[PDB]
Amino acid sequence: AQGPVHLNYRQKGVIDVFLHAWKGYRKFAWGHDELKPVSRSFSEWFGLGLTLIDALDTMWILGLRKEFEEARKWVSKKLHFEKDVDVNLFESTIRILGGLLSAYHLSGDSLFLRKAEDFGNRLMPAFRTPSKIPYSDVNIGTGVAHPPRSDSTVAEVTSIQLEFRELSRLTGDKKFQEAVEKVTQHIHGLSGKKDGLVPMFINTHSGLFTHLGVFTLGARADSYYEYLLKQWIQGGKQETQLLEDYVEAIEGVRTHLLRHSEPSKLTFVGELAHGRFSAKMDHLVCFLPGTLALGVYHGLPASHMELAQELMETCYQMNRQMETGLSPEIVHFNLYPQPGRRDVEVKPADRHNLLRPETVESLFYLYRVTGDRKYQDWGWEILQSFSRFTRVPSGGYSSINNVQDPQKPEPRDKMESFFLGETLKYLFLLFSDDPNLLSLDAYVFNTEAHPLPIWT
Numbered sequence: 013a014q015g016p017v018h019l020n021y022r023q024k025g026v027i028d029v030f031l032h033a034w035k036g037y038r039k040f041a042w043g044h045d046e047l048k049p050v051s052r053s054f055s056e057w058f059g060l061g062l063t064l065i066d067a068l069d070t071m072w073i074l075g076l077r078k079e080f081e082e083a084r085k086w087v088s089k090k091l092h093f094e095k096d097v098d099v100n101l102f103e104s105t106i107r108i109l110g111g112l113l114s115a116y117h118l119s120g121d122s123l124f125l126r127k128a129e130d131f132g133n134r135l136m137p138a139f140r141t142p143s144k145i146p147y148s149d150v151n152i153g154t155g156v157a158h159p160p161r162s163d164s165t166v167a168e169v170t171s172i173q174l175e176f177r178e179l180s181r182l183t184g185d186k187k188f189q190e191a192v193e194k195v196t197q198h199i200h201g202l203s204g205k206k207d208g209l210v211p212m213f214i215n216t217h218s219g220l221f222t223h224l225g226v227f228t229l230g231a232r233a234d235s236y237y238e239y240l241l242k243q244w245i246q247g248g249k250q251e252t253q254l255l256e257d258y259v260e261a262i263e264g265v266r267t268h269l270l271r272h273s274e275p276s277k278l279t280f281v282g283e284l285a286h287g288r289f290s291a292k293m294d295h296l297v298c299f300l301p302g303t304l305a306l307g308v309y310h311g312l313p314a315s316h317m318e319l320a321q322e323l324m325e326t327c328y329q330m331n332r333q334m335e336t337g338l339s340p341e342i343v344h345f346n347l348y349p350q351p352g353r354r355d356v357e358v359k360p361a362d363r364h365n366l367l368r369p370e371t372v373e374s375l376f377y378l379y380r381v382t383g384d385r386k387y388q389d390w391g392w393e394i395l396q397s398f399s400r401f402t403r404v405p406s407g408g409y410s411s412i413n414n415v416q417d418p419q420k421p422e423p424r425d426k427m428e429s430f431f432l433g434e435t436l437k438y439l440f441l442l443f444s445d446d447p448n449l450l451s452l453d454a455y456v457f458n459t460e461a462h463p464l465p466i467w468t
């Protein structure tokens with residue numbers, strides 16, 4: 013139990029956490045999608061070693077080469093896509109394809125690229141629709157795609173571009189990029205948006221937005237905005253339409269979803285349903301200050317930086333206002349000026365924490381762009397909370413049901429793959445004082461924290 017001497021104490025700490033988490037995966041869920049830390053068991057979503065693949069690049073970046081080699085062997089011998097299983101196009105793309113692509117780039121091991129190309133081909137049947145807008149699910153073994161148990165969600169079909177574009181770039185096979193870019197282009201000219209803000213669903217037959225008039229930056233839409241900017245960055249900042257749509261969208265957020273709480277005036281993003289504003293902010297929305305800061309770094313308006321800094325503070329508060337120091341799934345703010353009234357309110361139904369990375373993810377970007385060490389300090393505090401309230405003695409960490417009860421957080425007995433793929437990776441990078449480590453200038457992270465090279 014020892015780590016490299018050159019590591020500053022905070023990265024060192026992240027590694028200790030990763031090791032305790034991995035200890036659980038190896039002992040009770042090796043080769044399985046997710047670990048059930050409490051019951052020392054495991055769960056299967058796709059049956060593709062999800063946690064392992066999602067953690068490949070994180071292990072490499074943390075210098076856990078021994079563990080990486082071991083995981084590599086499993087991919088080499090146990091990973092088989094010749095399976096009769098339905099997978100979500102979006103979910104499998106960001107974790108499996110994205111994870112394999114990053115692993116390939118960091119290790120230089122062709123195995124990961126071979127698996128990526130295999131997986132990518134099995135996903136293509138999803139685009140066989142009248143509109144070319146892909147179905148939500150696709151059976152990687154039978155080759156048949158189909159809608160949800162309905163239309164497809166907008167964020168899902170517009171948050172797979174980074175991965176598909178890179179696969180085409182590496183293989184020379186243009187079908188991946190062309191299919192994915194068709195979607196992006198179709199969305200670009202689609203009416204039904206509200207100043208850049210997009211609806212949550214789109215019909216695969218008509219190719220039109222559905223559930224019109226309802227807008228959120230949380231689930232079903234969050235990554236759409238994220239990928240407009242990241243694709244532009246990935247392509248060497250030459251695709252102006254992407255930039256324009258992004259800039260328009262941020263203005264749309266300002267004009268329609270941005271409000272301030274009372275009495276502290278915390279800047280937050282709410283939801284809009286047919287003209288009615290809802291002061292409801294899912295933790296998922298905390299990806300925004302990071303994306304905003306990332307844009308500023310690449311030449312976007314300084315107003316984006318002000319907004320970034322304000323939302324980072326709010327996100328930080330969503331975490332720190334809780335008794336465990338961990339943000340709940342959803343937070344309701346107050347617009348009603350009332351003396352004794354606070355700003356943050358959480359409904360008993362939304363007090364869970366699934367070990368989400370959104371806050372630490374944005375801390376990473378805010379730090380890289382501003383250089384303010386307070387963002388590192390904030391991340392260290394959140395890590396402490398994960399260690400104190402989610403740690404499972406036998407190994408691993410678990411999502412919890414009550415973020416407001418430090419005496420009884422109530423483990424849900426589940427470690428999501430993104431805890432190791434995203435949360436611990438962003439924290440490790442946040443604590444790095446080397447701006448050249450996965451520089452914002454040379455790499456762009458997909459929505460599951462898998463770095464991809466910026467095209468030259």
Ligand SMILES: [Ca+2]
Pocket residue numbers: 235299459460
């Ligand atoms: Ca994400």
